[PDB]
Amino acid sequence: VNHNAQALNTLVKQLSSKFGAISSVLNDIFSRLDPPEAEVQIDRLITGRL
Amino acid sequence: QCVNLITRTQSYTNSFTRGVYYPDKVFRSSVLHSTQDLFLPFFSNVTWFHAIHDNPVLPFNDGVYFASTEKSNIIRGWIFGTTLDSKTQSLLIVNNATNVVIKVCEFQFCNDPFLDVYYMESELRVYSSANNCTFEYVSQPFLMKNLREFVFKNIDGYFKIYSKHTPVNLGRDLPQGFSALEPLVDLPIGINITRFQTLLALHRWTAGAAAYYVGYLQPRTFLLKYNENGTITDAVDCALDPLSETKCTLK
Amino acid sequence: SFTVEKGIYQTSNFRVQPTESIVRFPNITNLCPFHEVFNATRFASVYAWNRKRISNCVADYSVLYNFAPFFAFKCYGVSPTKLNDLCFTNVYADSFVIRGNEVSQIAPGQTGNIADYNYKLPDDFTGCVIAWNSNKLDSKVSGNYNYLYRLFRKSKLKPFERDISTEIYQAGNKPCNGVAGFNCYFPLQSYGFRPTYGVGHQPYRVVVLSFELLHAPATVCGPKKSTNLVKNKCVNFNFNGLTGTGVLTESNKKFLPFQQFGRDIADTTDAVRDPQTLEILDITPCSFGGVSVITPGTN
Amino acid sequence: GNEVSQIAPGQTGNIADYNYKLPDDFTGCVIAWNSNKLDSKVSGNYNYLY
Amino acid sequence: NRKRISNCVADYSVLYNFAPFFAFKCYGVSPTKLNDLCFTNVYADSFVIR
Ligand SMILES: *[C@@H]1O[C@H](CO)[C@@H](O)[C@H](O)[C@H]1NC(C)=O
Ligand SMILES: *[C@@H]1O[C@H](CO)[C@@H](O)[C@H](O)[C@H]1NC(C)=O
Ligand SMILES: *[C@@H]1O[C@H](CO)[C@@H](O)[C@H](O)[C@H]1NC(C)=O
Ligand SMILES: *[C@@H]1O[C@H](CO)[C@@H](O)[C@H](O)[C@H]1NC(C)=O
Ligand SMILES: *[C@@H]1O[C@H](CO)[C@@H](O)[C@H](O)[C@H]1NC(C)=O
Ligand SMILES: *[C@@H]1O[C@H](CO)[C@@H](O)[C@H](O)[C@H]1NC(C)=O
Ligand SMILES: *[C@@H]1O[C@H](CO)[C@@H](O)[C@H](O)[C@H]1NC(C)=O
Ligand SMILES: *[C@@H]1O[C@H](CO)[C@@H](O)[C@H](O)[C@H]1NC(C)=O
């Protein structure tokens, strides 16, 4: 039981990382940056979550 | 003008887990958060001063923890600076019955600054010149058995102040427990602070006394804890002992 | 495939679409005084640059283009075209005059004369700099001496800190006790702009804007009309510049007066406080779930 | 002159919203050069609308 | 031309006092960090173009 509980908790907790970007919230990046830099910041988050 | 009528004595005391403040203005509940910042190390030694109606200037090493329990309203305000001379800039946090005043000018401080009041508070006993400055500030009074705690630090040209009130039964030294401090103001001063002092008020002089504690902050890592209502009720110092290090590692 | 075998299969899941949109901004009516900043008769020196605090006003950032002959901003952490739609706590405006070749040092990480002895920027600067040439006015004739700058100093500065002392600097192990030469120099040396210098040597004008993010209640941001509050319905919202989609509900969380946001384990916003009516609300996504299809073989 | 930066994908404002909109997936070259002697006229050149 | 420079102390900060150039365009290093590195030899070229 504990293995599954801990694995799911770790997966949920991992969503708060930046992976080298400026924020961990996609909406803030979208609102504060133009697409040329928004893609560069967002691909890092996408790759990390993958 | 400048007179010398104050002598001070020093005693030593232990802290017992005091000096925890809220690291950010965000509500959290039922979580264990880890923060790395400047805090007061647990179980540290703090000098206990007695001012009796000469006194030198204390250093300012990466922040200062200031606590006192005098209910006679004799302590009011502090001086911050690097040389406390008319050749540099220095802060003059001063408090009175209705408002606080915060100024940073090229003050020419006296050796033993204080305030004298008669029958209408005066100010001439502190400095002589107040030119070359732009930054003034007023707000509500900071100061209202009762223990009052303050934390100051200077980072990125910003001066931050925290405070808290705690009704506590009389004791020989600081109490045991947890009471988190909440922020007051984050001023954009942007000056050099190396040494600091404290201000006293006398009646005309008539006898008086004051007692206050001083402690210095250090870069540490703490593991806070929030209850179900959003209040900090416990903490762990990561660099105190191996058991605390294990607790920090295991979260 | 064009043929499906017997079994149960999982297809795309269903989501509930939002109905309308919600915008909620504070009660601000007056306008920010950028004209008295940009259109100023006198400009301070680099060692005694001036900081002006701006608060409690509506900021129209497209107006600045009609104020001075500059080309474009160079913005770090934000983009020039989205200065609107964002609400900040405070806005500052540091202004001075420097030389053309030295404009490139107004940026994080730069070192040299400035960024070590005159004006230092932090490593996490959020904001940007407006620079343009000012040969026509600051270089009237036979140079100028109103603009000073520190030449050398015993140690580097720190972000946004200021030094104003005018002392005598020693170069030899003897005390100067006044200016005497060969050890003693007056650190405030002045350049003079003759109206004949090269392009890189002509004077320039600099205005730096620094933003801090939302931790205190918002005071400065651009124009945006605000609608009413709609609750118990999936809807996309906008609270002081943060977007999302969910359901707004009455809350009972005990926010302290200095707090205005809530966070979850994943550090995602959970609760929020309405800027106009200081009440507490909850945010929950509207319903979704998987869908499966049960079929025998197409044969 | 200070409006050249608006001729690019993702730009917003006056020109890029009311006069000339470029696609976000634009491909090609954009070239702009100053033209003052043959464009500016004393008492103001008025036959240029936006 | 091509001049070989060796066995000397290079001060790259004084270059700004010899010609009115705005800044550098550097590929493997940065202009601000040229004061720390130590090189084997340095080659300087010069010509005039349009
Ligand atoms: C604090 O200083 C006193 C000096 O009187 C010393 O006895 C005590 O052990 C010190 N506390 C420490 C080092 O934690
Ligand atoms: C306290 O300070 C405020 C602010 O300077 C001032 O207006 C007020 O008169 C002072 N009160 C007394 C009793 O001096
Ligand atoms: C204020 O500063 C200026 C130069 O910064 C100095 O000349 C002047 O004497 C100062 N005012 C004083 C010392 O009252
Ligand atoms: C938290 O608030 C609730 C509100 O009713 C109260 O019942 C409870 O005692 C509080 N808990 C603490 C630890 O103060
Ligand atoms: C500044 O204000 C004056 C008077 O309002 C105006 O004539 C001028 O065009 C403005 N701009 C500049 C750059 O002087
Ligand atoms: C502040 O003053 C101290 C003492 O004179 C000096 O050592 C320090 O370098 C100063 N701060 C800065 C940023 O130079
Ligand atoms: C905000 O303004 C509206 C009208 O624009 C008014 O009805 C409302 O009472 C105001 N709220 C506050 C808190 O001032
Ligand atoms: C070249 O050297 C001469 C003599 O010192 C000097 O007058 C001149 O300004 C120098 N040229 C440049 C571009 O520095």
Swiss-Prot record, chain B:
Binds to host ACE2. RBD also interacts with the N-linked glycan on 'Asn-90' of ACE2. Cleavage of S generates a polybasic C-terminal sequence on S1 that binds to host Neuropilin-1 (NRP1) and Neuropilin-2 (NRP2) receptors. Interacts with host integrin alpha-5/beta-1 (ITGA5:ITGB1) and with ACE2 in complex with integrin alpha-5/beta-1 (ITGA5:ITGB1). May interact via cytoplasmic c-terminus with M protein. May interact (via N-terminus) with host bilirubin and biliverdin, thereby preventing antibody binding to the SARS-CoV-2 spike NTD via an allosteric mechanism. Residues 227-248 are annotated as: Putative superantigen. Attaches the virion to the cell membrane by interacting with host receptor, initiating the infection. The major receptor is host ACE2. When S2/S2' has been cleaved, binding to the receptor triggers direct fusion at the cell membrane. When S2/S2' has not been cleaved, binding to the receptor results in internalization of the virus by endocytosis using host TFRC and GRM2 and leading to fusion of the virion membrane with the host endosomal membrane. Alternatively, may use NRP1/NRP2 and integrin as entry receptors. This is Spike protein S1. Changing residue 112 to Y: In strain: Gamma/P.1. It comes from the Viruses. Disulfide bonds join 2-110, 105-133, 238-248. Residues 1-250 form the BetaCoV S1-NTD domain. Changing residue 57 to A: In strain: Omicron/XBB.1.5, Omicron/EG.5.1. Glycans are attached at residues 4, 45, 96, 132, 192, 229. The chain holds residues 14 to 304 of 1273 of the full protein. Residues 116-131 are annotated as: Disordered.
